[PDB]
Amino acid sequence: SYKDAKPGKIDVNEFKKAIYLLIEADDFLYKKAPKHELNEEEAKEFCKLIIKCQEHLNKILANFGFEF
Amino acid sequence: ISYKDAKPGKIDVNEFKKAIYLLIEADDFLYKKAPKHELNEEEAKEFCKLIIKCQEHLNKILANFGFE
Amino acid sequence: INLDKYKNLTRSLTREFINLNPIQRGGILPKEAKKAVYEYWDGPIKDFLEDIAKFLNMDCARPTHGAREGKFIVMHAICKEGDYVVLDKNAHYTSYVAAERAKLNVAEVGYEEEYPTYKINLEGYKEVIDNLEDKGKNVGLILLTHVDGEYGNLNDAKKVGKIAKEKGIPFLLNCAYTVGRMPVNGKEVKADFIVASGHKSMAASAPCGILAFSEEFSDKITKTSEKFPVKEIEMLGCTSRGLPIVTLMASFPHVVERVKKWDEELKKTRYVVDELEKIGFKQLGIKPKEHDLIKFETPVLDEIAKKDKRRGFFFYDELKKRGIGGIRAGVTKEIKMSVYGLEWEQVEYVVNAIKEIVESCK
Amino acid sequence: INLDKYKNLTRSLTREFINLNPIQRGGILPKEAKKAVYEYWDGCPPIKDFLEDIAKFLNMDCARPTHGAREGKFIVMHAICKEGDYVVLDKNAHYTSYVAAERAKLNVAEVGYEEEYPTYKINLEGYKEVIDNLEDKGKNVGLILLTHVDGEYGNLNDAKKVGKIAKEKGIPFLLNCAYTVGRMPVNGKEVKADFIVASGHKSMAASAPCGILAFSEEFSDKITKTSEKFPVKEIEMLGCTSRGLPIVTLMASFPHVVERVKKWDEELKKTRYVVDELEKIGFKQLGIKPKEHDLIKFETPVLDEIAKKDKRRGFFFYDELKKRGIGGIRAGVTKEIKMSVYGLEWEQVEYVVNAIKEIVESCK
Incomplete structure (x- = not known):
């Protein structure tokens, strides 16, 4: 829940990295248009961007009392 | 959860555009709370709400590539 | 390399x-435009030009690349090669260059007081005009910076507006630091031309600007070409597409709400x-x-x-x-x-x- | 409202x-440009250095930023050509080449085709024949324009041919490269061009409006003519320091542009x-x-x-x-x-x- 959020500081660097990865993952919307269907190799590359992004977003939530 | 387990799937354009918008709306916290970026109990709840919803959308993106 | x-x-x-x-x-993009940036960072304009005309109480309005361009649009289509342009002494540097690009002359208006007010003597506008007309020189345009970019002094554009109406000389109101921050009435201040910056006071990205004018000079400004009777001459094209113009149309509900x-x-x-x-x-x-x-x-x-x-x-x-x-x-x-x-x-x-x-x- | x-x-x-x-x-921004947009969302990159590199990239003497190829054509016609001069250009010229010429108070002469359907190839040798008929009248030709690649058929023209003719008759040569610079490699001196205009949002992977104006040292004193009141701000450039998004996207996509041309x-x-x-x-x-x-x-x-x-x-x-x-x-x-x-x-x-x-x- 977000209601359990405690006071804290936002990690600008981790947010910049988290938003950068989603920008790099946006290229797949262009290069794989319009079906957007990935194979096994394209999925591994794409999901690697989504996972690393969440790893940065989790570090952001850490400064507000969220453990993982 | 490993990115190497990623199986062939389709990218959700709608669910991806929602995850981006949340980081864009949360990008206002980096401006309106500069330079210390230190939030309180209400600002954190408001901020973490966006990041939690963001990852929730990213998890639904991974759900198309053999994740749960 | x-x-x-x-x-x-x-x-x-x-x-x-x-x-x-x-x-x-006043040029900081809201989260509204930031989303519009995402959608259009590659590749209702006609309805926006009408609403921005109602937003400034003006007859017509055209998109430009800043107040820098818009002030050249009026000086190149109205004035002759040699006409004098009378402006205040607290004018922006883009006012002296855009006039020199149109090959014009510059006449400055003295202060009402120097230190520490530096307020422009608006009544001095009438005097400068007479000092040039008596010497045979022809006045083509009256420029007035609404808010200067040195001290930030707001001037009564209605004063110079009346004087411009009495002499019959076209009046250009520089609203680079005005339109977008505060409400602006075009017809009340008796203006014939109004320029505004989008990346300075309308929460957009550079280069962005707006040129407003009355129906009296609608034919001179929007004069079409001969070879192509659709494409406007002074605008070089009716397209006017890009990234700044997108940010201006998306930040518009924010600006029209932040002026209040x-x-x-x-x-x-x-x-x-x-x-x-x-x-x-x-x-x-x-x-x-x-x-x-x-x-x-x-x-x-x-x-x-x-x-x-x-x-x-x-x-x-x-x-x-x-x-x-x-x-x-x-x-x-x-x-x-x-x-x-x-x-x-x-x-x-x-x-x-x-x-x-x-x-x-x- | x-x-x-x-x-x-x-x-x-x-x-x-x-x-x-x-x-x-050719105006599609890569991922490296999108990141730069984010970093400058609110609206100090090496501008001066980028203008030297873009010159070397085009093998020209000087270069300056514009708001597109529309501006680039107006800058030269207004700073080089005197009011009333003639502009001789190919028949497949873009509409902006006529509008800008009419804005700079000039006249336009068109060069016919070598063959129409289906090639619609421009007679590059016919350029001299048109100028002579204007000088024998005699009207004075102030500029020779050539759309390197037109926007109707996308045909390529040997710019060196027109550049070699322009040099013999001593008339300035503007090579329109809105559909050229950024996609294919272009050499300024090799085609004997005095001016080169580009469209950053059409071929240089930048966002609109953006453009580049490269020119020779011969006309450097006229294009970069400084004002009198301000001995720093350029007249034709309106003294802009060139800030904003399109210029940043241009510099951010520049290494991608310089690599995709090879x-x-x-x-x-x-x-x-x-x-x-x-x-x-x-x-x-x-x-x-x-x-x-x-x-x-x-x-x-x-x-x-x-x-x-x-x-x-x-x-x-x-x-x-x-x-x-x-x-x-x-x-x-x-x-x-x-x-x-x-x-x-x-x-x-x-x-x-x-x-x-x-x-x-x-x-x-």
Whole structure:
């Protein structure tokens, strides 16, 4: 829940990295248009961007009392 | 959860555009709370709400590539 | 073959620092435009030109690339090669260049008072005109900067508007620091031309601007070409597509809503002025301030810089240690700042920081 | 004032569809430019150094930033040409070459074709013949313009030919490279050009409006003519420090631009594949054959015969492409189309070609 959020500081660097990865993952919307269907190799590359992004977003939530 | 387990799937354009918008709306916290970026109990709840919803959308993106 | 200063470019302090620079306070993109940026960073304009015409109470309106271009559009289609353009002494540098590009002459209007007000003698406009007409010189355009970019002094455009109507000379109102921050009435101030910057006061990205005009000069400004009876000459094309124009149409509901809350932006300004005049600052320009642009005289800053510290760069460095930017490094004799669009908590942070700077530096 | 039309403005098919608009093919920003947009969202990069590198990249003397190729044409005609001078240009010139000339208070002379249908190739040798007929009148020619690649057929012209003629008659030469600079390699001195204009949002992977004006030292004192009141701010440049988003996207995409020009044949390979594969249906490539540019113009008699017996008239081709997620074609027009596959992945190239083959086959 977000209601359990405690006071804290936002990690600008981790947010910049988290938003950068989603920008790099946006290229797949262009290069794989319009079906957007990935194979096994394209999925591994794409999901690697989504996972690393969440790893940065989790570090952001850490400064507000969220453990993982 | 490993990115190497990623199986062939389709990218959700709608669910991806929602995850981006949340980081864009949360990008206002980096401006309106500069330079210390230190939030309180209400600002954190408001901020973490966006990041939690963001990852929730990213998890639904991974759900198309053999994740749960 | 360098390619080294283009890879590590993606790095700034736009989010890690508080920007006090006046030329960028009213040009900060809201989260609305940021989403529109995402949608259109590659590849209702006709309805926007009508609404922006109602927003300024003007007959017509055309998109430009800043107030820089719009002021050249009027000077190239109306004036002759040699006509005089009478403007105030607090004019922007783009007013002298756009006139010289159209091969025009410049006549300046003296102050009503110099230090520390620097208010333009609006009644002097009538006098300058007569001094040129008696010498045979022909006046083609009357320019008036609504709010100058040095002290931030708001002038009564209705005064110069009447004088421009009596002499029959076209009136251009420079609203680069005006349109987008405060409500502007075109027909009330008796204006025939109004220019406005999108990246300075309309929360857009550069280059962005707006040119408004009456139906009297609608044929001169929107004069079409001969080879192509659709494409406008002075606009070089009816397309006018790009990234800035997108940000202007998306930030428009924000701007049209933030002009109504202009008095809330005066409260932050006057708070900064009154609270900083305690530590040893003195506001130049029209008192009290009616615009977010403030220019302080700082004798205390120049003294601390003298002995000793790191000279005039001591103030800029002390602000960087606290996460504040927007002040020219090395300049201590005076400072130019703006708190438009800043949260009140950030307004208190700037004031309390500067107070602690001059205090800790004895 | 209704503000509802600005609210839901964030609705587009820019990622869900494959755009085939030739104008927007070379203006697609990479990921490195999108990051720069984020860093400068609110609106100090090495501008001076970028202007030296872009000059070396074009092998020119000097260079300056503009708001597109529209500005670049007006800057020279206003700073070099005197009011009333003649501008001799090719017949396939872009519309902006006439509008800017009319804005700079000049006259225009057109150069005919060497052959019309289907090549529509410009007679580069006929340039001298037109000037002589103007000087014998005698009108004075102030500028010689040549669209390196036109925007109707996408034909390439030997700019050195016109540049060699311009030098013999001592008349300035403006080489329009809106469809050239950024895609294919261009050499300024080699084609003997005095001026070169570019379109950053059409061929240099930048966002609109943006452009570059490269010129020789001979005219450096006129273009970069400083003002009198301000001995620093340039007159024709309006004293702009060139700040904002399009200039940043240009510098951010510059290493991508400088690297994709060496792989230009790989983009022509895509182009020539499309031509040689669609000509099995009934399409006939107009312009110079084979294609020397990504901008292709097919004559489509087949699409006309289907449009005469389809319920959606000539709009059937625009609708059938929407079903398959493809855009960039003028709606209602079936007599001839104008597309491009520059920058597209080869998987997407096959997707486009195979789509059209299924349209012409299913619609009889």
